[PDB]
Amino acid sequence: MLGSSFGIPKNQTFDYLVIGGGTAGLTIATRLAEQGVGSVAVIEAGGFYELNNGNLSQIPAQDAFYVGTDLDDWQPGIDWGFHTTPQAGAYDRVSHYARGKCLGGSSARNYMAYQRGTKAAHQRWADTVGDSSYTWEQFLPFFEKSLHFTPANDALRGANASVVSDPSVLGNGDGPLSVTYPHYAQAFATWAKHAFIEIGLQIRSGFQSGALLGQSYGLYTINATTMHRESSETSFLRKGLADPNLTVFQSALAKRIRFQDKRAVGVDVETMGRAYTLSARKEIVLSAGAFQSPQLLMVSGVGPAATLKAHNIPLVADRPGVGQNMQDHIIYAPSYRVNVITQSALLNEEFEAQANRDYNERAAGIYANPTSDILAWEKIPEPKRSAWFSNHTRQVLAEYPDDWPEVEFLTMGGYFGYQRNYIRDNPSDGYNYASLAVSLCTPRSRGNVTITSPDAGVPPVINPNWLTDPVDVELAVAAFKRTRDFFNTTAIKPILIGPEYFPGSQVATDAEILDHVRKSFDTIFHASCTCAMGLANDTQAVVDSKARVIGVEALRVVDASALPFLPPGHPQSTLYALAEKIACEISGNC
Amino acid sequence: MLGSSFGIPKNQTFDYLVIGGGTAGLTIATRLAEQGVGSVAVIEAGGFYELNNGNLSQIPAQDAFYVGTDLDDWQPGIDWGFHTTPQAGAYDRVSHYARGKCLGGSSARNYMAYQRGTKAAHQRWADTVGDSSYTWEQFLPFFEKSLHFTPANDALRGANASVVSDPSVLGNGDGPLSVTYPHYAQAFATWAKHAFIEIGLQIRSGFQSGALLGQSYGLYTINATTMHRESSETSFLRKGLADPNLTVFQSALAKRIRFQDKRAVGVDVETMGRAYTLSARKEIVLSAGAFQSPQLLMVSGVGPAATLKAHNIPLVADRPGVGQNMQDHIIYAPSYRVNVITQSALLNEEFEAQANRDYNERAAGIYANPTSDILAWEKIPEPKRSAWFSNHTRQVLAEYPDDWPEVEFLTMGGYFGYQRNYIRDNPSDGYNYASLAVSLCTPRSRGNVTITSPDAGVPPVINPNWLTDPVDVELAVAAFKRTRDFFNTTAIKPILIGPEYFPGSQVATDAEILDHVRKSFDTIFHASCTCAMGLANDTQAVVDSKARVIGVEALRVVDASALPFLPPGHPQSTLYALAEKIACEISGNC
């Protein structure tokens, strides 16, 4: 009975509460319920994205809806409508920062890329938090536990789009999280493989074995049968319905964590104006993400003393790291008109109608593609390194491990432009558009989150502060010039129609390149480290290596906020794994 | 793809809009979508009751949750939290009036009784609205079209609980609305059959063939396989999700119908704070029910001129009938301790655990019962008639048709008391409690609905005004004495434990009985006739026989508000049928 899984908004007691039915939230809630620790309730402000955002969150190719910087490019059924402070690195631009408000959280909204960090990143993690269980070899089983891998389908993809994978690290098939290759590869990506080789990027066997340098076809959180998005909702929550130990509270806003002495004992909740308190006998897990986890700590009395005093919040623990040390990745892309099919073709009615039938009848065609296909990773090579970087920049980059890339390239079968609104500004003049996006994997810029109010119903103040460190500025210009090197290869030339479409060659000098990047970049949505994992004796750390909040009892944080630092690339794989790990830490029954 | 059925909250155009995803709403929306008239959108303020009220709305025996008169006996996931004005007939009591806020509306909340009115009621309907298609023989196919009848299961019910039905009027099996007999009959009802005969109520072949006088086992909107509630959501909406012509907007509040000249062209909607306008090319159907249909007309400029002026609403049509002539039924019941299992046994943990397993594993046991089982109908008999009624009362009752009953009796395997809150005040002292409820089928009292604001987000002012006509007062006392006659039968005596438990024999005189009824009665939730069907030339009528709103174009009302008068007994059968009829009227493709 479906309804048996869903809670009634009144005072009651569970063994465990998880705040936030997002990526980490639904994973840890489902695993705790299955691991015999007693009753678990998960509290989520949103509903099902299948009811609240049409089929836009279910179709991989529709992932560009409601992610633009424009303040109005969102709707309240899937997005919080959060905007940044005026951004020092983006000419004081106030931008929309997309966050999932739904069961699945930002796993309902992401571009579905599944890629793990490097052995050396895991080594740095182990060192920073003083726990060797975070080293690659000890952590890997938690990465594998979640997965149901399906190999590439060569018949639907075409021979051109053959993949190089490492199945030995993609689990035993028993996990609920579908990971596979899309049934459709962008024709652009097929050409990009040759261009990547010409600029010195060797093919490797996927991005799941603890190394990145080189190129490969990406793996995605997509169901191999339906080519629907795989979120934490379609994977973990669907398994957890059927577990009588799991209760879901949806359309439910957590307002305050309650403390008796320094012990977390319950959560104040509002469901459609009805206030109630859920009590926890054992532990509360905060999984509200990089913006709202720190906000809930602060309005509950855990955070910087001066902030809590200024908003009349009684102090429970002076923890100055709460909302500090925010890390993020950025993305921007030039675009060309190309002589191959890209997502542009969906603007043509006769083409869309065929793609629509291919998707629903055969799980095939361009709708079955998340826009991306091939990722590539490098250090900026010599001799460009000495020309493009100051001595200070080269000294800072030499402190990163050899395996830790500086720049990520992503094939995109669509137009980025200024990323104001990808749907409105999608060029409609009858050409196919493709982009080569770049992301920077060594961000030095640090941001923060604070509050204007003790009410969690008021949005937090979000200041990512991207592109403010001189190292990020120099890297941003270098990455842009590498996209120009990609587009000047003889391998890619035959599909290009005329010169660079966006921005165009008139963007030439270092200062013009920087100015264009400052106008055309956005976050790639990897906000993290606002409840950073570190040593219990570090006054800036928020959680220890067991994800316990320092200064209080029976409270953990398990989400992107808990990361000690942002590892290179796409973090969802790591958040699934971290949730798997802290579930076993709590239960002891794995 | 589920999401393909659900709308995005932005400006867009459909051929038809239905306001209110309730009993009538989801029926007409689904049928219009199937009948080739183009695109249909349904707008509903609530969500799925399966997500928003646990399993309480899915289990028939849990129908007593959130229906009490106490102002706090509701939660915002299934109920509007409406209260009445101070009630002239109930010692100025301000009472909660349960209304479904969910897909299915009040079909999510009702006691699931399926019973039709009388041939003579249908004759009066035809005469009042000037349309012979409302006579029994012409209207019957619209009653049958909806249904999937399953016969009584004698093996699960027991031989004691054999039924007398007329399958020839219960359709061909093709309709989505499950109607059947419960898998479990209250032991109390089994005894009640003999007691009903002793006080002169003969067995008849069900309540679906245009006659009521006598007794029979009731038919219910329950799925025959699962013994889950059958709402308009589990029947019509579930069929309509496969129809690409149907779009659902849930968590969507309609604020205003828009008029160009006198033509309805769109609806102003708010979904979680996001305002948008849905446009209608052809017709708008208002299905917001007896309280909110008249409210939406008035805030849109259709209603009594003086009311709209007083709240700064521009006048579109002076229609003084809007919100007037409200009709309703009431219910109250004495109770006895009884020597048989009733719903009381669910307070015993060992009994509940077995009933829980019986329900989920075999669709059997007391959870598979809607509380009622046998209905009985009469005129107050002679010689009690001359003793209990004034000459004026007898003159008014003689104007009703011979087939139209004055009093309904309902077996109830539970305690009513003052109906403040059935769950809190459920006696827990170890006895089984049963009640014999009565409802009055000839209400003379008339109520109304008005507004305090042009904002549909502000609740309407709801004044049922029950028990204010001297005919209803005399009938209320007579009905109560007939419950005493039932409980003094020699047939029922052997299961009674001690004397009348509630109110008790100390309630003796006519004035004491009236006083007790005024304290212990509530609505039985049949609010209707606030957008009454009549002749186009009647200034008090709101809709014509085609359900078109008089004085404007392209606007219909199809719900309990549209009834010309309240027919005897349970109206959901008539609302399904009326929705079937106006669907065919609109489409011309049946």
Ligand SMILES: Cc1cc2nc3c(=O)[nH]c(=O)nc-3n(C[C@H](O)[C@H](O)[C@H](O)COP(=O)(O)OP(=O)(O)OC[C@H]3O[C@@H](n4cnc5c(N)ncnc54)[C@H](O)[C@@H]3O)c2cc1C
């Ligand atoms: C557009 C986009 C693209 C991305 N692409 C990728 C990608 O391709 N690969 C990848 O690895 N990562 C990607 N990411 C990032 C990755 O998805 C996120 O880092 C991850 O989803 C965050 O997980 P989380 O559990 O930390 O938070 P979330 O998944 O955001 O979960 C937080 C949850 O808590 C709820 N919540 C917050 N406050 C409250 C409250 N008070 N009460 C109740 N509920 C509350 C929210 O509604 C939400 O459901 C992308 C992000 C976005 C936005």
Ligand SMILES: Cc1cc2nc3c(=O)[nH]c(=O)nc-3n(C[C@H](O)[C@H](O)[C@H](O)COP(=O)(O)OP(=O)(O)OC[C@H]3O[C@@H](n4cnc5c(N)ncnc54)[C@H](O)[C@@H]3O)c2cc1C
């Ligand atoms: C507790 C209870 C027991 C009952 N028992 C029985 C019984 O056993 N048998 C029987 O025959 N009848 C019974 N009834 C009555 C029967 O269920 C109702 O008369 C019938 O459901 C009314 O249907 P409707 O479409 O007129 O209104 P509803 O089904 O109430 O539909 C109105 C819908 O419109 C929505 N809405 C209102 N305003 C807006 C707006 N502005 N924007 C968007 N959506 C809006 C509401 O949320 C609701 O879903 C019972 C009623 C109740 C409350």
Ligand SMILES: *[C@@H]1O[C@H](CO)[C@@H](O[C@@H]2O[C@H](CO)[C@@H](O[C@H]3O[C@H](CO)[C@@H](O)[C@H](O)[C@@H]3O)[C@H](O)[C@H]2NC(C)=O)[C@H](O)[C@H]1NC(C)=O
């Ligand atoms: C309607 O919803 C209720 C859940 O909200 C449900 O109550 C729950 O019933 C489950 C059994 O399915 C109980 O869970 C049990 O879990 C372990 C199994 O590993 C048992 O050993 C325990 O005894 C425990 O009872 C929950 O205790 C119970 N929860 C609540 C809130 O009471 C009802 O069962 C549902 N009703 C029906 C008829 O299905």
Ligand SMILES: *[C@@H]1O[C@H](CO)[C@@H](O[C@@H]2O[C@H](CO)[C@@H](O[C@H]3O[C@H](CO)[C@@H](O)[C@H](O)[C@@H]3O)[C@H](O)[C@H]2NC(C)=O)[C@H](O)[C@H]1NC(C)=O
């Ligand atoms: C994602 O959701 C969209 C609708 O919510 C859906 O678009 C809709 O698709 C249907 C076809 O499935 C169109 O309805 C058609 O119905 C009749 C058949 O009797 C046809 O003759 C008509 O031409 C009509 O097209 C709707 O027009 C269309 N709605 C809109 C707004 O376009 C998408 O198809 C869904 N996406 C996928 C990939 O399935």
Ligand SMILES: *[C@@H]1O[C@H](CO)[C@@H](O)[C@H](O)[C@H]1NC(C)=O
């Ligand atoms: C619910 O819990 C809170 C705090 O424990 C309390 O303020 C409130 O009164 C409770 N409500 C009820 C009905 O007990």
Ligand SMILES: *[C@@H]1O[C@H](CO)[C@@H](O)[C@H](O)[C@H]1NC(C)=O
């Ligand atoms: C993929 O979807 C199909 C069809 O819905 C389902 O049978 C399967 O379980 C899903 N796979 C995973 C691994 O979730």
Ligand SMILES: *[C@@H]1O[C@H](CO)[C@@H](O)[C@H](O)[C@H]1NC(C)=O
């Ligand atoms: C690969 O195949 C697709 C579709 O057949 C085609 O559009 C694309 O150009 C091909 N690529 C190469 C490199 O030949």
Ligand SMILES: *[C@@H]1O[C@H](CO)[C@@H](O)[C@H](O)[C@H]1NC(C)=O
């Ligand atoms: C956030 O960072 C900005 C820029 O570095 C700084 O000036 C601001 O005060 C910080 N806010 C908090 C509350 O730490």
Ligand SMILES: *[C@@H]1O[C@H](CO)[C@@H](O)[C@H](O)[C@H]1NC(C)=O
């Ligand atoms: C009753 O429920 C069963 C199982 O869910 C289903 O197969 C059947 O179609 C339902 N019947 C109706 C008419 O809703």
Ligand SMILES: *[C@@H]1O[C@H](CO)[C@@H](O)[C@H](O)[C@H]1NC(C)=O
């Ligand atoms: C009918 O049978 C049931 C046994 O299931 C019993 O509880 C009930 O009293 C019986 N009624 C009569 C009148 O014999």
Ligand SMILES: *[C@@H]1O[C@H](CO)[C@@H](O)[C@H](O)[C@H]1NC(C)=O
């Ligand atoms: C939406 O429709 C209304 C109705 O006229 C009007 O405010 C405006 O034209 C539309 N707004 C947008 C954002 O298109």
Ligand SMILES: *[C@@H]1O[C@H](CO)[C@@H](O)[C@H](O)[C@H]1NC(C)=O
């Ligand atoms: C509604 O009914 C009452 C009688 O109970 C009457 O006094 C009142 O004026 C009516 N109000 C409206 C607005 O018709």
